Paper text:
Next, we solved the apo structure of the HN/4-10 [name] HA by X-ray, and the complex structures with avian or human receptor analogs [LS-tetrasaccharide a (LSTa) and LS-tetrasaccharide c ([name])] by cryo-electron microscopy (cryo-EM). Conversely, in the structures of [name] G228 and [name] HAs complexed with the human receptor analog [name], the receptor adopted a cis conformation, accompanied by a reduction in the number of contacts with the HAs compared to those of LSTa complex structures. Nevertheless, both structures formed conserved hydrogen bonds with SIA-1 at residues G135/S136/S137/E190/Q226. Notably, residue [name] in the [name] protein formed two weak hydrogen bonds (bond length 3.6 Å) with [name], whereas the interactions were notably absent in G228. These results suggested that the G228S substitution to some extent enhances the binding ability of the [name] HA protein to the human receptor, which is consistent with our SPR results. We examined the RBS structures of [name] and G228 HA variants after binding to the human receptor analog [name]. The RBS structures of [name] and G228 HAs were highly similar, with the [name] RBS being slightly larger than the G228 RBS. However, a significant difference was observed in the orientation of the sugar ring, where the C1-C2 atoms of the G228 GAL-2 were rotated outward by about 40° compared to the [name], resulting in its GAL-2 being about 3.9 Å further away from the 190-helix than the [name]. In general, for human-receptor-binding H3, the distance of the 220 Loop from the 130 Loop of HN/4-10 [name] [name] fell within the middle range. The HA of the [name] [name] variant shows a stronger adaptation for binding to human receptors compared to the G228 variant.
One of the key factors for host jump is the switch in sialic acid receptor-binding specificity of the virus, mostly determined by amino acid residue substitutions that occurred in the receptor-binding site (RBS) of glycoprotein HA. The discovery of a degenerative codon at position 228 in the human [name] A/Henan/4-10/2022 HA protein sequence, which may encode an amino acid residue G or S, suggests dynamic viral adaptation for human infection. We find that the human-infecting [name] HA has a dual receptor-binding property with a preference for binding to avian receptor, and the G228S substitution slightly increased binding to human receptor. We then solve the structures of the [name] HA protein in complex with the human receptor or the avian receptor, and identified the structural basis of [name] infection in humans.
Residue numbers in the entry:
A (entry chain A), C (entry chain B): 12 to 329, 336 to 502
B (entry chain C): 12 to 330, 336 to 502
Amino acid sequence: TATLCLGHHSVPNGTIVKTITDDQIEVTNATELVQNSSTGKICNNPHKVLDGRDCTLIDAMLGDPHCDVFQDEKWDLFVERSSAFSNCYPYDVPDYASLRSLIASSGTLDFITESFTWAGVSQNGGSSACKRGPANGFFSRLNWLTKSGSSYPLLNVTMPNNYNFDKLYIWGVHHPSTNQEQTNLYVQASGRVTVSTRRSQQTIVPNIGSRPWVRGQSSRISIYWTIVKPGDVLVINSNGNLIAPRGFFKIRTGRSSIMRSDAPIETCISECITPNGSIPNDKPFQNVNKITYGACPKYVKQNTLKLATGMRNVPEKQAIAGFIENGWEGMIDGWYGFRHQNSEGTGQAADLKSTQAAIDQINGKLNRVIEKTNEKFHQIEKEFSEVEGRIQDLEKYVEDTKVDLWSYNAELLVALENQHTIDLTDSEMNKLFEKTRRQLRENAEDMGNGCFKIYHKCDNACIESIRNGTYDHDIYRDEALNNRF
Amino acid sequence: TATLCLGHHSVPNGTIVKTITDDQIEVTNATELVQNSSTGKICNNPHKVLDGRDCTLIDAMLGDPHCDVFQDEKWDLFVERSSAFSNCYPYDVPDYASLRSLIASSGTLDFITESFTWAGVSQNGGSSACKRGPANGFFSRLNWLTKSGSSYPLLNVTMPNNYNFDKLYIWGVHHPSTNQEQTNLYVQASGRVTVSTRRSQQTIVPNIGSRPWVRGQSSRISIYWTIVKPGDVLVINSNGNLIAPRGFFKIRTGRSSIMRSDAPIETCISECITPNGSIPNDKPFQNVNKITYGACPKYVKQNTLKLATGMRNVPEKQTAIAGFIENGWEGMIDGWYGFRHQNSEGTGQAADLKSTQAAIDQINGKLNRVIEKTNEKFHQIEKEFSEVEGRIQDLEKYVEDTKVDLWSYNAELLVALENQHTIDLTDSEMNKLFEKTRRQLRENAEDMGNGCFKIYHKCDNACIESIRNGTYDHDIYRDEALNNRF
Amino acid sequence: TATLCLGHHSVPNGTIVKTITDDQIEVTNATELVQNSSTGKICNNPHKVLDGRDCTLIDAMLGDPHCDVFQDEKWDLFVERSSAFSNCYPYDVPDYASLRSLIASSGTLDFITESFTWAGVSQNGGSSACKRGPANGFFSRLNWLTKSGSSYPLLNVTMPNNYNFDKLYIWGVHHPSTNQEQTNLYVQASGRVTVSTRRSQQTIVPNIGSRPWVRGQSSRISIYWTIVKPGDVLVINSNGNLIAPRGFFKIRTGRSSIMRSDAPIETCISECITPNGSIPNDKPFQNVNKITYGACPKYVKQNTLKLATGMRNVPEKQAIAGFIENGWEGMIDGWYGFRHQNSEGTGQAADLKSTQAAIDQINGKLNRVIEKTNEKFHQIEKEFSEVEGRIQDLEKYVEDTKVDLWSYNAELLVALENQHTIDLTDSEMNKLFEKTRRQLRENAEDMGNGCFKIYHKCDNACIESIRNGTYDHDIYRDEALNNRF
Ligand SMILES: *[C@@H]1O[C@H](CO)[C@@H](O[C@@H]2O[C@H](CO)[C@@H](O[C@@H]3O[C@H](CO[C@H]4O[C@H](CO)[C@@H](O)[C@H](O)[C@@H]4O)[C@@H](O)[C@H](O[C@H]4O[C@H](CO)[C@@H](O)[C@H](O)[C@@H]4O)[C@@H]3O)[C@H](O)[C@H]2NC(C)=O)[C@H](O)[C@H]1NC(C)=O
Ligand SMILES: *[C@@H]1O[C@H](CO)[C@@H](O[C@@H]2O[C@H](CO)[C@@H](O[C@@H]3O[C@H](CO[C@H]4O[C@H](CO)[C@@H](O)[C@H](O)[C@@H]4O)[C@@H](O)[C@H](O[C@H]4O[C@H](CO)[C@@H](O)[C@H](O)[C@@H]4O)[C@@H]3O)[C@H](O)[C@H]2NC(C)=O)[C@H](O)[C@H]1NC(C)=O
Ligand SMILES: *[C@@H]1O[C@H](CO)[C@@H](O[C@@H]2O[C@H](CO)[C@@H](O[C@@H]3O[C@H](CO[C@H]4O[C@H](CO)[C@@H](O)[C@H](O)[C@@H]4O)[C@@H](O)[C@H](O[C@H]4O[C@H](CO)[C@@H](O)[C@H](O)[C@@H]4O)[C@@H]3O)[C@H](O)[C@H]2NC(C)=O)[C@H](O)[C@H]1NC(C)=O
Ligand SMILES: CC(=O)N[C@H]1[C@H]([C@H](O)[C@H](O)CO)O[C@@](OC[C@H]2O[C@@H](O)[C@H](O)[C@@H](O)[C@H]2O)(C(=O)O)C[C@@H]1O
Ligand SMILES: CC(=O)N[C@H]1[C@H]([C@H](O)[C@H](O)CO)O[C@@](OC[C@H]2O[C@@H](O)[C@H](O)[C@@H](O)[C@H]2O)(C(=O)O)C[C@@H]1O
Ligand SMILES: CC(=O)N[C@H]1[C@H]([C@H](O)[C@H](O)CO)O[C@@](OC[C@H]2O[C@@H](O)[C@H](O)[C@@H](O)[C@H]2O)(C(=O)O)C[C@@H]1O
Ligand SMILES: *[C@@H]1O[C@H](CO)[C@@H](O[C@@H]2O[C@H](CO)[C@@H](O)[C@H](O)[C@H]2NC(C)=O)[C@H](O)[C@H]1NC(C)=O
Ligand SMILES: *[C@@H]1O[C@H](CO)[C@@H](O[C@@H]2O[C@H](CO)[C@@H](O)[C@H](O)[C@H]2NC(C)=O)[C@H](O)[C@H]1NC(C)=O
Ligand SMILES: *[C@@H]1O[C@H](CO)[C@@H](O[C@@H]2O[C@H](CO)[C@@H](O)[C@H](O)[C@H]2NC(C)=O)[C@H](O)[C@H]1NC(C)=O
Ligand SMILES: *[C@@H]1O[C@H](CO)[C@@H](O)[C@H](O)[C@H]1NC(C)=O
Ligand SMILES: *[C@@H]1O[C@H](CO)[C@@H](O)[C@H](O)[C@H]1NC(C)=O
Ligand SMILES: *[C@@H]1O[C@H](CO)[C@@H](O)[C@H](O)[C@H]1NC(C)=O
């Protein structure tokens, strides 16, 4: 007689994963699906990263004297450091966030000088709070107009848009601290600024009052913006307290954005940028930060998610035995194989078809459901330094909802994939056993432990024929029937 | 002896679907789950669709002379064309989108005239920029008040809400271009308009300055609105630059909305409306547009999603009968599973109705168990913009993108899971039929290894029919079968 | 000979669930996953709940005389009743919702009095619309300044923030009804109020005009707020129509919120609070309300969702029979068992291993994918008493999208879990049958009804050995072979 057994490989060190029906189960191999670390650096390729050392985007746009190196710059991502500061005339911007977001999304600081004509007033006003070297200065992109002689005539100028692109204009209004200062600068006792197009209008009345000292000034300047479509026209009408523009900014559409971070910039290649630094995007999920730019993994709350890439791990108990509650640590060539006890001796081989089928099924399984990468460039703000109320609450609620939903999706997907992997491996083993049983019609009996008891003389050639699939039962039919009964 | 085989049908041309464990597998039949085309026309039933033609909703509400045909109109969906224009006094509306959404959601333009008394001022002002035929005119729902004689007395009027429904009032403020114009129209050198109720107030100070010429006017008019609850009182106080209302609009709660489109309107029936036109809602997902009205399929990014309907398609081997082991039967058209028998009388074929019916019943109605039939949404947020604004527009775009991504992922996962379960159930049905057939023959037959049984006794057509029916009795063949086997 | 059967238990009354491949299937046991009822009361533990009674949060903060009991109060959840009313000077708050949300999220009403100096004006103004007992009064936290003698000097005061926490200041502007009233109260014909810090500024110009009578007054007061960071300074500049503050509120960060409800408050323990009342949080989903505070189940549209707990329910048909299309209602000591017919007599036993395995797999099944509870404290508003436009539409859209997505998730999860439960129970039964068949090598053959017939004499000891797994086929092989052939 002879003995033939079927079994599967095993490893000394397994990994614990989670499935639908099992809290913990050990498998031969697994991979991590969550990226939870960063190098702390921001790669300068392939995106064009612009580093604002001590300047905010708004200050660079306005023309702060210590931000003059940023003139006519372009970027894919603008990085704002926490050590940035303002060193010019004090100012405030109503709807600061909207202007900052639109400027960042434009992605360029291209400025074109236009020939504005201001008759009856003095131009190029300066202050000691904004020093350009040893002399008083001002924002390079703004014009401060004051009285000439002893009069401030009413200003009424126009400028049409004859190009094929939109124009962005930045202008301002001056708020004096005292009535005497207001009358000294502008002869009128109450100024007025009106800027309008064929479809929109804005009018600001300056406010007079004391304010906390900032770099020796108790006055302030408010900043406003206007966009002129092609074929439209811009009209500026003012009675005083006007901070005139010097030109327009060319506004574009693209995939530029802005980020707050303190990480240094190095020479490397990475497609994902986070405030903590660049991270690889070879995993579907990440746990570093919910603020991202480029092709990045989705953010989830979990810090680890193991995906099974192997079969169940079962130790070998201490006469050969099959796969019934028994693994084989001696199999190196494949995942499934045959162990036979013969008159010549004990042998062992491996089956390539079932192993290849299992490997092909397992490989690239996660790519069938989830997308490879998602590219997001400009999004909403997710961190705030001041309390505002309704809009901030809405933004926080939206972000929280998105994070929770994606975390649930990731958990469910991992559990389902692990369960299906275990099921497919078990099914492959059972299919191999059933095929082996079908090959031997009545010359063998099931020993009950994953092994077959062949009742005729089966040499090495016979075992090889069984493994190949060319076993002929009619040859040994009579001998096996005689031996069994 | 005799031979009995079990197998399943196959088709000459199959469809390729995607499962959890397989990226490309061929099945006998599949159906498309994504609607990706439209007729290009908007059906006028069962929803009431109002064509705006060359008028916007705000212009129609205000009373533009060329929009006078829209007085006291009702709609379920208001369609705005891209060729609409304004032909009256130039104006601007602070928070234009909010007022547009409010009017669209109200769903009606019902106007009730009220008896307002304005003492000491002239009424029914007109301009050459708003012509009512050959003569000067103005907005039909607004009253322009100017000085009478040489004085403009302070106006102080009241109007109580004695009804049981809310009132919507539309009023305005005039912005002169020059100080001389302001003094000429109204005696005071600085106007002031105050409209308030018991719980809210609004005050506007007009601005004087030149503006680009629009239809011969360098002045502008601002538009404001106020809502008066039942039992409340409206008080209007002004001393210049007031564009008085003539009445109130009835405001209702319903399922009306507004849509921007250029598609023509035709006579047909459709429950879903998109800017591209109407689309059928028989499929759970669509790819036409993310802007929808009515009972519409959910929007996804995928162009196509095939749901498996039949079994795995296996070609017939060209080579003695064979079973279902890696071989399909091309000659079966009366069922999904059947028997092929080789006998002394001759060969034959049949079909098993029970297993086929069970598989069909399991497959039928499969997607309705998870996905709800259809979702009905009427008024939503705006999803396309023509100007850059900043924070709010970014938030709206982010919300829409998040929703679209989540629904696309859900659709992909659902399709993969359903295909996998369909394949598994079909294979299980085939295996169960084979196991039952084996269980019927206790010791008179043995498995041949290729999905066929070798019966070791003379089994005529009646015996085969008894096997197929399930009334086979092995006792009266047992002796002969055991004698033949050994 | 002897007969051995394998089967599973059944119950007289079952329940219907839904699976992936079945519209309706009856199981032996199921549990409800959706909470759809409440006791109508709000439990006062463990959260600190403050009853607003007939006062609103804004009125309590301002210092309404009938809300004086709320001074220096703390809360985790503030409950606003629909019967609340105002009984002081008429007022309006621009961006009322933002201030309400800010105060609610702060979670305290701690007030610190500061020594402001107002030179040349009279303080502690009062009105008949706000009665402090028999005499005229005003808001306790606000100071009404009017002319002294026949002059109203320009006011210019400062207050620095030398602490290490943020300060919140509440101030106001008075709107007279007539020019004569404006002149009588304040000498100047046009007032002006300017409040600013080193980084922000606000200027309000009062408006004069008649307004509807409210408690005998045709005038109004507009409320504004300002926040001063540590190291900053507050400057107040005005020349009329100023409602001065008396101090600052301590603003904190925490998990406090506000709710609108009419349910009474009783003494009990509950972690979840809804406007309908408190609900238990032992279920993953709830259908009571979409407004929640604390550890609450997720809100879904469905009102019922049944999760399978037992196996399929098959009534027993009317010579023992196995599990093939037949259940056993007489078995109560286990889920799976054996029935044998013997010469000595019939019997019945239960198998504990398979039952324990099935119970362990079923137990804690839902905890493998979904979390126990999610804690949410402060969120967006979800019900509105008036129409506003864009922001309200955005909030409603966000809430609707979240609800729809979570409902879909719940439905799919329930269907998948039910399908897997049915599959695992069937697999357990089939595995037990296969093991029993494997034990009997050649001494028995399946008769097709889930039972085995044994061709040798098998007494109670032999049946017990078969159940235990110690059955030896070699002892009876010869007798069984002789009987079979
Ligand atoms: C309405 O009320 C506000 C607030 O009370 C007033 O604003 C103050 O205005 C005064 C000037 O009028 C300001 O005083 C100035 O402060 C400067 C900054 O002080 C800081 O830095 C110095 C030096 O580093 C420190 O010693 C000091 O502690 C602060 O940390 C000083 O640099 C100025 O000095 C100048 O004047 C002195 C006068 O002796 C000279 O000796 C100096 O050389 C130099 O020329 C000056 O002291 C004060 O800071 C303002 N306060 C605020 C909060 O802004 C308004 O003036 C008031 N309006 C009216 C109309 O009354
Ligand atoms: C502050 O600054 C603004 C901007 O510069 C000034 O606004 C301009 O005002 C003038 C009038 O004061 C406007 O000129 C008028 O333009 C009308 C439209 O012009 C278009 O159409 C004509 C014909 O189709 C074209 O030829 C032309 O190129 C334009 O395409 C004209 O129809 C008007 O014609 C009137 O005057 C002529 C003079 O000969 C008469 O013959 C006519 O019958 C008719 O009465 C007129 O020419 C100009 O368009 C305004 N510009 C803008 C941008 O709005 C403010 O006036 C200024 N304010 C102060 C106080 O100085
Ligand atoms: C601009 O226009 C507005 C609106 O028309 C005017 O506002 C009105 O002003 C008058 C004058 O004060 C107000 O009249 C007062 O109404 C009080 C409330 O009335 C209600 O309550 C009483 C008692 O419950 C009811 O009987 C009554 O029907 C109302 O339901 C009264 O209590 C006042 O009575 C006082 O005056 C009378 C005069 O004889 C005395 O006998 C009384 O004892 C008491 O002293 C008074 O009648 C009216 O309510 C205001 N209406 C609104 C809507 O606000 C502005 O005055 C006007 N501005 C200018 C400059 O003209
Ligand atoms: C455009 C212009 O007029 N620039 C002035 C500037 C303005 O007058 C002022 O800053 C507007 O608020 O003032 C400069 O001087 C400041 C200086 O002025 C004296 O009159 C005053 O006595 C000093 O205390 C001090 O404020 C400035 O450098 O800011 C001069 C500049 O030309
Ligand atoms: C209600 C009223 O007064 N309507 C007037 C209107 C207004 O005076 C004006 O539009 C307010 O801005 O003006 C109308 O004439 C415009 C006409 O006025 C002359 O005085 C001027 O010299 C011309 O150039 C021209 O602007 C108009 O039709 O708009 C007359 C109308 O009665
Ligand atoms: C701070 C102050 O001046 N309080 C007054 C208050 C104000 O004058 C008024 O409310 C501002 O609008 O008015 C009080 O009197 C109300 C009373 O005043 C008479 O002059 C008038 O003729 C009456 O009709 C009536 O309005 C008030 O109690 O509100 C007095 C208070 O001292
Ligand atoms: C990436 O940077 C963020 C900074 O926003 C880190 O998040 C903070 O971590 C600290 C320390 O645990 C917490 O006190 C803060 O509350 C966190 N902030 C937020 C907004 O969550 C994050 O830990 C960093 N991650 C890595 C991997 O470095
Ligand atoms: C339905 O109409 C929309 C119009 O918004 C079409 O979307 C545009 O398609 C063109 C052509 O590919 C693109 O260039 C635009 O960028 C698309 N716009 C947006 C907002 O996506 C859409 O293709 C139409 N669909 C059908 C089936 O006709
Ligand atoms: C819990 O309270 C809410 C209050 O909003 C109830 O919801 C309302 O129920 C009534 C009665 O059917 C409806 O007419 C309203 O339209 C509902 N409002 C909303 C916003 O849905 C809810 O039914 C209560 N639930 C329980 C279990 O008491
Ligand atoms: C485990 O799987 C990973 C990825 O599938 C593979 O790179 C690795 O070699 C595997 N480990 C072993 C021991 O085969
Ligand atoms: C394929 O399925 C669809 C619907 O499921 C059905 O209408 C069609 O007839 C099927 N195809 C065949 C060849 O039966
Ligand atoms: C049904 O299941 C629940 C929870 O698993 C359990 O409490 C209950 O006792 C079960 N019913 C029966 C009859 O065992």
